[PDB]
Amino acid sequence: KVFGRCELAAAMKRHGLDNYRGYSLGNWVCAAKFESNFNTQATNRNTDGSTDYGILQINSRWWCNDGRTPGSRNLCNIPCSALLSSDITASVNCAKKIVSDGNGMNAWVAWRNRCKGTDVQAWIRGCRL
Numbered sequence: 718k719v720f721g722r723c724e725l726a727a728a729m730k731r732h733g734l735d736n737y738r739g740y741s742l743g744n745w746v747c748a749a750k751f752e753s754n755f756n757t758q759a760t761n762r763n764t765d766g767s768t769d770y771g772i773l774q775i776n777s778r779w780w781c782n783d784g785r786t787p788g789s790r791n792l793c794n795i796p797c798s799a800l801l802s803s804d805i806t807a808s809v810n811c812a813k814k815i816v817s818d819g820n821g822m823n824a825w826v827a828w829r830n831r832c833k834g835t836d837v838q839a840w841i842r843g844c845r846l
């Protein structure tokens with residue numbers, strides 16, 4: 718599924734991501750924009766052989782099982798394919814664990830490089846939330 722901007726913001730809010738770990742909704746929408754362009758089916762192979770999955774590009778090196786990332790963990794206790802669903806529940810639940818791991822949203826390098834410190838409120842501008 719390719720979400721609209723406000724559609725995703727609403728879905729994130731419905732799943733308790735709004736201000737989770739002190740990160741406003743715009744931060745989450747911005748991260749999704751630059752990780753996946755709001756496409757739940759996005760997958761990208763990393764140079765090390767792990768893969769990033771879904772709307773928030775969650776990495777099989779630590780968070781989900783894809784069966785082909787030797788030496789990796791599955792800390793969200795989920796198949797990586799579950800992170801590609803139209804319903805964002807699994808990606809949100811797993812993102813909550815990631816953002817709680819110590820470094821906040823810096824875990825998402827695209828958030829750090831493209832969202833951190835910017836006017837992230839713009840991402841929810843106009844949205845009926």
Ligand SMILES: [Cl-]
Nearest residue numbers: 721722750755
């Ligand atoms: Cl957009």
Ligand SMILES: [Cl-]
Nearest residue numbers: 741743837838
């Ligand atoms: Cl915001």
Ligand SMILES: [Cl-]
Nearest residue numbers: 784785786787
């Ligand atoms: Cl594996």
